[PDB]
């Protein structure tokens, strides 16, 4: 029952190609951590 | 119409679906992109392109993602580098690791890049993060200077359940982290 | 648990989440599978690859698909070969053309093709097909000698809606067609 | 019109952990335009 929230408009078609990949990254450099991930869940859809 | 979806509750040893870049790889349920170790760049994406908008009509897609992770560092001081969820070419491949997080180069602005990232970071990199010091979210598009960030206490070792949400007919893209 | 599960309602020119295999590819917005021209092959797959069963766990996976398509002679009689939905190692590559519909090899069972597929075969192979010599539905396992037949009258030039389940519990496979 | 065929086929017999799914066709010394017009699929496995 701690939350973080963060609107913006980003209009995706601008920036990103029209077919894309998703994922994750996570890196370390003179300090660091593990950085995991415990399950991933996505839907799009396009009309 | 066209749809993409799917879900992975537990993450496999042979997790076929996803592709790893890096030093990124599955293990005990877990999908782990670093474990605690210098110098570490690890990235794993969905195997499939995802139709995010299409030219022949103008229609950009509607996406939502949830996923939960644990960041686990020796003690609160020392923590480093971040996470992120990004959106990016089809051939994407891993950029610079430190401050860079895995997806970005540089601190000014490239539309060569067409990635757009949520991050959640950890060390404030006096080049290009809030000057206050802060861990925080982040909405980065083409450069690792976000275009927005928020302040996020991190809570070392435990899970934090994330939901990223846009919606194409106001292009918002809104992100929310849990701890419990 | 893991789900996959996409939609693709309309094809695009650039269906970038299909792998395409001989001169299969997308046009006037159907997935294009062959021309009206002798000894071709085109076969599509969808680019992620599916966890259709675990071994550290024993469990199996249920699975719907369904799709629209229309076969398209000249006369109901000069029609050949056949079409098919198939599942199938990872890496499959388009096996003999003709009347095996580039997914099988001997009528003698190989245990190393490992590939099950539904066919909808509008062309009779004296040597491996009902003696009827009718057209027809079948459950293909590692032969192109179905296990199983339903008689089909083709409606040459129709589309058709087929429904194709899975049931782990059961271990059975329905196959519904259905002419509108 | 409809036509329904069933049977039991223990898929883990026959096909590897991981599978590409797809359609097939293929013309010999006769020929047919084989064309899909849309396409539905889900699978679940539980853990
Ligand atoms: C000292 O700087 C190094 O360590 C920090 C903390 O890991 C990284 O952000 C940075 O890229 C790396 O150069
Ligand atoms: C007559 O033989 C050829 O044509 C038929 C019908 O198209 C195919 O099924 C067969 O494999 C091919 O060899
Ligand atoms: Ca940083
Ligand atoms: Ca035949
Ligand atoms: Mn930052
Ligand atoms: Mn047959």
């Given at each position: 029952?701690?939350?973080?929230?963060?609107?913006?408009?980003?209009?995706?078609?601008?920036?990103?190609?029209?077919?894309?990949?998703?994922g994750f990254?996570?890196?370390?450099?003179?300090?660091?951590?593990?950085?995991?991930?415990?399950?991933?869940?996505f839907?799009?859809?396009?009309? | 119409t066209?749809?993409?979806?799917?879900?992975?509750?537990?993450?496999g040893?042979?997790?076929?679906?996803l592709?790893?870049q890096?030093?990124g790889?599955?293990?005990?349920?877990?999908?782990?992109?670093?474990?605690?170790?210098?110098?570490?760049?690890?990235?794993?994406?969905?195997?499939?392109?995802?139709?995010?908008?299409?030219?022949?009509?103008?229609?950009?897609?509607?996406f939502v993602?949830?996923?939960?992770?644990?960041?686990?560092?020796?003690?609160?001081?020392?923590?480093?580098?971040?996470?992120?969820?990004?959106?990016?070419?089809?051939?994407?491949?891993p950029?610079?690791?430190?401050?860079?997080?895995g997806?970005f180069?540089?601190?000014?602005?490239?539309?060569?890049?067409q990635?757009?990232?949520?991050?959640?970071?950890?060390?404030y990199?006096?080049?290009?993060?809030?000057?206050?010091?802060?861990?925080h979210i982040?909405?980065?598009?083409?450069?690792?200077k976000?275009?927005?960030?928020?302040?996020?206490?991190?809570?070392?070792?435990?899970?934090?359940?994330?939901?990223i949400?846009?919606?194409?007919?106001?292009?918002?893209?809104?992100?929310?982290?849990?701890?419990?």
């Open positions: 029952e701690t939350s973080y929230t963060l609107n913006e408009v980003v209009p995706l078609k601008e920036f990103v190609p029209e077919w894309v990949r998703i990254s996570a890196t370390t450099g003179a300090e660091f951590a593990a950085h995991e991930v415990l399950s991933w869940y839907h799009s859809e396009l009309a | 066209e749809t993409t979806s799917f879900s992975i509750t537990k993450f040893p042979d997790q076929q679906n592709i790893f890096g030093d790889y599955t293990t005990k349920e877990r999908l782990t992109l670093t474990k605690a170790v210098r110098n570490t760049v690890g990235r794993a994406l969905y195997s499939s392109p995802i139709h995010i908008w299409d030219s022949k009509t103008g229609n950009v897609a509607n993602t949830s996923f939960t992770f644990v960041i686990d560092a020796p003690n609160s001081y020392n923590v480093a580098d971040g996470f992120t969820f990004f959106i990016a070419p089809v051939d994407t491949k950029q610079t690791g430190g401050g860079y997080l997806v180069n540089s601190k000014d602005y490239d539309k060569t890049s990635t757009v990232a949520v991050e959640f970071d950890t060390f990199n006096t080049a290009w993060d809030p000057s206050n010091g802060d861990r982040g909405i980065d598009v083409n450069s690792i976000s275009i927005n960030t928020k302040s996020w206490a991190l809570q070392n070792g435990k899970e934090a359940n994330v939901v949400a846009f919606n194409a007919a106001t292009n918002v893209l809104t992100v929310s982290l849990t701890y419990p």
